[PDB]
Every structure is written in structure tokens, then in C-alpha cells.
Amino acid sequence: TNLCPFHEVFNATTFASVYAWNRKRISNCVADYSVIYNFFAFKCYGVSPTKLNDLCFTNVYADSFVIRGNEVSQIAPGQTGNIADYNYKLPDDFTGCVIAWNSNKLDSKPSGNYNYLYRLFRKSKLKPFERDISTEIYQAGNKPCNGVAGPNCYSPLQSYGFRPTYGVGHQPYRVVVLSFELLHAPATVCGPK
């Protein structure tokens, strides 16, 4: 008789940086994905949201983070780019939904909100749902780095600079990725039933 806490992830004051993206696990609850049917932009792969109310799952995962508007298209199966290669990867066989909404009013400020970071480069591409939170400065030359960028010493993360007067593709977007997992265990997350 417990309702699923989807509203807690959608209405959180605080979203994670994409390189250190947040995952909530959701289990043992009645779900109403009419929430996901209700300036938001949703794309479901493999299911229909109205049909989701007729399904049960073992767990549901809610991944959330903030990215740039012109990067939202990389949160899709089979995509490649800056964010999908190095920050958040969806598997090609992805069953789930991507919801993204403009967050300019909350995540921008005139002096620049620099509090969201993203990864610039990586030793290999991210596997699906892999999360790399390394922040150690990459040492390229013989000289050690000591936490600060310099010659031959590269910070792997960079801040977005979000300002409200930027164009849409450069102002901040909040995004949640709902996965629906089903495995050799009883299914706890059912629909309105």
C-alpha cells in the first residue's frame, strides 16, 4: 500500500553532477507512471507509459543528473558524444524512459552557476550505467601534479558555467532515467493495482 517515491526524485532541490550521477533504487511500492505522462519532454524506449501501469518489476532505478540542453540528445540508446562516451552511457538494448526539463530558473545565476561538473576525457569509454567519480588530476609528464592543474597536469572535470541569458542549448537541463529491471526474484514494483 506504499506509493512509489517518484515525486522525491522529480522534485528534489538538488541534482547530481552528471559525472557523479545519482541513482535511487525504487522497490516494494505501487507506481503510477501517469506522473511521467504529465514543459517536460519524455521519450520511452521499449514500453509505453500507459502500458507501464499494467506491468510489474523487481526493482526500478531512477538515475538523475544535470547537463547542457544541447547534450540532452546523448541520453538515448546507441548515442555517442561528449556526455555519452565519458559521463553517462545508456545500453543499446535500453528499456526505459528519459525525462528532461529546462531548469534555467533553478540551476543558473547571472554570475554563473559553476556547481555542476562534467568529465572531459577518459581512459576508455563508459560501459552502460557505469559511474566514474575519479577526480585525480591526470599526470602526463614526469613531474607530479599535486591536485592542481598545470603544465602536463590535466583536470579531468570542468564546470558548466550556467547563466540564465544563454541560449536554450546552453542553459541547464535536469534529467531522470527510469530503468525497469526484471530478474529471478519476485516482482515488487507493480502498477495501480
Epitope: 558524444g81 572531459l120 577518459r122 581512459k123 576508455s124 602526463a140 609528464g141 602536463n152
Partner: antibody, heavy 123, light 111 residues
Framework: EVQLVESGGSVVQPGRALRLSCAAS????????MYWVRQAPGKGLEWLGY????????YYADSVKGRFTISRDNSKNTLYLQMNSLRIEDTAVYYC????????????????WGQGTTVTVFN | QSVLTQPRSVSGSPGQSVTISCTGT?????????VSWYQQHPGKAPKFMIY???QRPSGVPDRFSGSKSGNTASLIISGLQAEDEADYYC??????????FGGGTQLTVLG
């Protein structure tokens, strides 16, 4: 700062083969994906291709895919362009350049270039 | 993927602004924000000037800036200095880990 020195350009007959070298100073070479770019006299830049820092991948412009081979020897700090079945169209300056960022990077730019090596193809 | 089209030549007087255009297609410049710019002086290697359409790498003056609109990217140089007389190439991702250079633009700083 890292220095790149291209070598191996020469006057060659059409149809022969030629291997270009590109040697990097210091030890920074193993961390960076390298590129090849060419420029025909008085013409614009032509992106040729790329090899990753660890050799994991190699990419090629369509104009030379299947005819040119890019490789690298991280032991010797040196990048290679193997040119086969040379054409008149191949006469140009040949540049090697390092990615702006180390490791898998790719989406930003080529920030350090060599001075170039000239290839001239006539019978 | 086809060359990116830049005006063959363009000119401006010292202290003025000039903008170099760079028009491609839906599958390059109109698809991605990985648009970069290079500056090349006589007999020299190109120099890296803009990436991500308008970010600048280390040591490039703020008088260099970029913008993108549909399939056209632009490079804008305000307060022209004499050192700026050079050729300028745009550069764009074309998908599938391929990069493409534009045709090149001769900028002459009138002296």
C-alpha cells in the same frame, strides 16, 4: 612544451609507397591520441585520420580510408603514416598533431602540431 | 563528408570587427556543437583558437569568439590587430568519429 617533428617526405613516383614519421619530444606521447593532417600547396587543410593513445581505435577520412595506414610505437614516441599507391593528388605538406586532451578525448581540437614534411609525387 | 564552405577572402581595418562564416550540413555543423577554429600564418602550422563553437584554449584572447546558427558557424574577431592577418579554417565533427575542415578564409588586416 612538447615538440613534434615530421620526417620522411620526399619526391616519389606515382604508384610507389612511402612511410612518414612523426617523433615527439619528452614522454607525453603515450597519453595522447595523435592525428594526421595534410595541406596541398595553396589549398586548405584536409583531415586524414587518427589513432588513439593506446591504439584502441584508428579512424580515417573517406578520401584515404583503405589506402593510408596510421600506426604508432609508444615505445619509440613516434607516429607513422604508411602511404600506399601514391597519386598526383597526394602532393602536399603532411602534419602530425596532438589532441588537446590526453586519453580518449576527440571532441575538442588539435593543439600542438609539427612543422610538416613535404611529399611531391610526379613521374 | 563534404568541405565546409567559408568565404574565400575577407578584410577589416585595425580595431574593427570581422566575422568569418562556415556553412556545412545537417550531419556536421548543424548536428553537433563540436565546431572548432584554426589560425594559420604564412609557412606556419595551424594554431588552435576555438572549440565547442565558442570556448577558447589556453592563451587565446577574448577578442576571438564564435557562434553557431543552423548549419552555419561563425568566427568573430573584434578589435582587429595586425597579428590577426592569417588564414582561418573552421573544423567540424561529422559523426562516426570523423572530422572535416572547411575551405579556409584569407583575412587581410588593412595596412
Amino acid at each position: 612544451e612538447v615538440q613534434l617533428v615530421e620526417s620522411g617526405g620526399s619526391v616519389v613516383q606515382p604508384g610507389r609507397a612511402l612511410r612518414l614519421s612523426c617523433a615527439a619530444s619528452g614522454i607525453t606521447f603515450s597519453s595522447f591520441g595523435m592525428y594526421w593532417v595534410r595541406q596541398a600547396p595553396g589549398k586548405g587543410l584536409e583531415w586524414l585520420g587518427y589513432i588513439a593513445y593506446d591504439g584502441s581505435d584508428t579512424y580515417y577520412a573517406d578520401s584515404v580510408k583503405g589506402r593510408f595506414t596510421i600506426s604508432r610505437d609508444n615505445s619509440k614516441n613516434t607516429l607513422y603514416l604508411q602511404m600506399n599507391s601514391l597519386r598526383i593528388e597526394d602532393t602536399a605538406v603532411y602534419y602530425c598533431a596532438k589532441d588537446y586532451y590526453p586519453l580518449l578525448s576527440y571532441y575538442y581540437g588539435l593543439d600542438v602540431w609539427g612543422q610538416g614534411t613535404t611529399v611531391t609525387v610526379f613521374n | 563528408q563534404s568541405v565546409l564552405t567559408q568565404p574565400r577572402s575577407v578584410s577589416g581595418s585595425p580595431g574593427q570587427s570581422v566575422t568569418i562564416s562556415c556553412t556545412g550540413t545537417s550531419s556536421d555543423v548543424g548536428a553537433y556543437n563540436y565546431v572548432s577554429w584554426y589560425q594559420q600564418h604564412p609557412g606556419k602550422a595551424p594554431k588552435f583558437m576555438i572549440y565547442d563553437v565558442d570556448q577558447r584554449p589556453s592563451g587565446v584572447p577574448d577578442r576571438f569568439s564564435g557562434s553557431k546558427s543552423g548549419n552555419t558557424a561563425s568566427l568573430i574577431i573584434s578589435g582587429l590587430q595586425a597579428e590577426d592577418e592569417a588564414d582561418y579554417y573552421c573544423s567540424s565533427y561529422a559523426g562516426s568519429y570523423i572530422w572535416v575542415f572547411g575551405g579556409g578564409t584569407q583575412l587581410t588586416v588593412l595596412g
